[PDB]
């Protein structure tokens, strides 16, 4: 099976460094030519460069906006592809894709074909800040289906992530994108379940924020 | 350093309806790729080498053109097919996308289902205090909230978020926080939640009235 999986991704100050990598599995690594491509939040697909096969002596083709700062390059003995980033800007905040490029035949259909989940790289001054997880319950049940949530809020960088009751619970749910103010984020989270189970079954949501180490789990109590 | 511009930035169409958009570029390239990318997920290959459809994607698509114009067509707009569309060109070093191109379902008008809440004691403890409200699942998009505290609108301190087209049913759903001073919430006593959306030319609203116990 293909597998592409970048990490590495996270916060770094302006003017520093940050080494991303993509472990790949499922195919002939060597074969192929591989891209990085990034998508700032909110914006469009942009291509940075790739890095060829073993045929092609592994050369490597860059975009202008990186070309000089950014360095690509791999290990084909665990099959990793890695870019070297330096000297970061405000402009390199993004989710960072890589991708199985062309290989040495004709199987076009498959070039571009394959994408990693991706990482975000946060480049900014600002410093880590753990989220605050805060109950969202109802006060006053003349309805059937009832909506509770979490709130997330003051934390540093993106993304947190959540999920209720270990995920067992998965539909009916929103998670909200995250609002950003003076260099602190906010999300919620909402979750809707029918008025029988809760609060007779228990909720809670499970908040993780990777990037302040902070795994936080708050159950919603009913207000009495 | 070909620069690709697509058009339509955003749109909607009814199911059955006949989508195209459109992708120009400042220089010729020898074929125009295209991607379909759902909100949260990576990008994928829809359409390569110009008019060839990807892995498992349906016959209603088909993409054309030549030179310095390209263009992906969609014979029937399925309720799937909700995504954003971006053009790339791998003609010349350096490879490039399009702006891309928002492309919204339509679907049966859907009234907002409204949640208000106060701020948790946990929170108050930090003398900073957020009441919340969801307004979900809801269609059209277009959307208005505001809070009023006993009778006064506020908007100091009132941070929204809009999601993208629900994937599973089409709706959007948005939620409302107003971040006040534990000190300033303990001076008010009513806080309402008004949205006004086209599916009630009476205003919906929830609320809750800060209560000691
Ligand atoms: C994924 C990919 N990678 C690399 C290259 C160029 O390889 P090179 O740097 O070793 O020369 C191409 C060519 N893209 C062309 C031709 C591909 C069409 C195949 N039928 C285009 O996208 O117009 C490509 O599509």
């Known amino acids: 099976e293909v597998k592409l999986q970048e990490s590495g991704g996270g916060l770094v100050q302006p003017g520093h460094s940050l080494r991303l990598s993509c472990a790949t599995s499922?195919?002939?690594?060597?074969?192929?030519?591989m891209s990085w491509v990034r998508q700032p939040p909110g914006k469009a697909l942009e291509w940075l460069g790739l890095i060829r096969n073993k045929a092609n002596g592994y050369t490597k083709e860059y975009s202008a906006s990186v070309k000089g700062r950014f360095t690509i390059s791999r290990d084909n003995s665990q099959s990793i592809l890695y870019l070297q980033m330096n000297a970061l800007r405000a402009e390199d905040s993004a989710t960072y894709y890589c991708?199985?490029?062309?290989?040495?035949?004709?199987?076009?259909?498959?070039?571009?074909?394959?994408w990693g989940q991706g990482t975000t790289v946060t480049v900014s001054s600002a410093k880590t800040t753990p989220p605050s997880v805060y109950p969202l319950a109802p006060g006053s049940q003349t309805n059937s289906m009832v909506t509770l949530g979490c709130l997330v809020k003051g934390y540093f960088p993106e993304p947190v992530t959540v999920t209720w009751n270990s995920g067992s619970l998965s539909s009916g749910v929103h998670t909200f994108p995250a609002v950003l103010q003076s260099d602190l984020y906010t999300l919620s989270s909402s979750v809707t379940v029918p008025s029988s189970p809760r609060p007779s079954e228990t909720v809670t949501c499970n908040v993780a924020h990777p990037a302040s180490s902070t795994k936080v789990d708050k159950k919603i109590v009913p207000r009495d | 350093d070909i620069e690709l511009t697509q058009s339509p930035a955003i749109m909607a169409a009814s199911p059955g309806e006949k989508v195209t958009i459109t992708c120009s570029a400042t220089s010729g390239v020898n074929y125009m790729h295209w991607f379909q990318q759902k909100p949260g997920t990576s990008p994928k290959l829809w359409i390569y080498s110009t008019s060839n459809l990807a892995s498992a994607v349906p016959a209603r698509f088909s993409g054309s053109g030549s030179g310095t114009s390209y263009s992906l067509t969609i014979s029937r707009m399925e309720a799937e097919d909700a995504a954003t569309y971006y053009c790339?060109?791998?003609?010349?070093?350096?490879?490039?996308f399009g702006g891309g191109t928002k492309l919204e379902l339509k679907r049966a008008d859907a009234a907002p289902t409204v949640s208000i809440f106060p701020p948790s004691s946990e929170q108050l403890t930090s003398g900073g205090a957020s009441v919340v409200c969801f307004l979900n699942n809801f269609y059209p998009k277009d959307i208005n909230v505001k809070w009023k505290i006993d009778g006064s609108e506020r908007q100091n301190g009132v941070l929204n978020s809009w999601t993208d087209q629900d994937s599973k049913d089409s709706t959007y759903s948005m939620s409302s926080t107003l971040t006040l001073t534990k000190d300033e919430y303990e001076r008010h006593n009513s806080y309402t939640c008004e949205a006004t959306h086209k599916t009630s030319t009476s205003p919906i609203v929830k609320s809750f009235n800060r209560n000691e116990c």
């Open positions: 790339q060109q791998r003609s010349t070093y350096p490879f490039t």
């Open positions: 991708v199985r490029d062309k290989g040495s035949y004709g199987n076009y259909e498959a070039w571009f074909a394959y």
């Open positions: 499922g195919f002939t690594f060597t074969d192929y030519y």
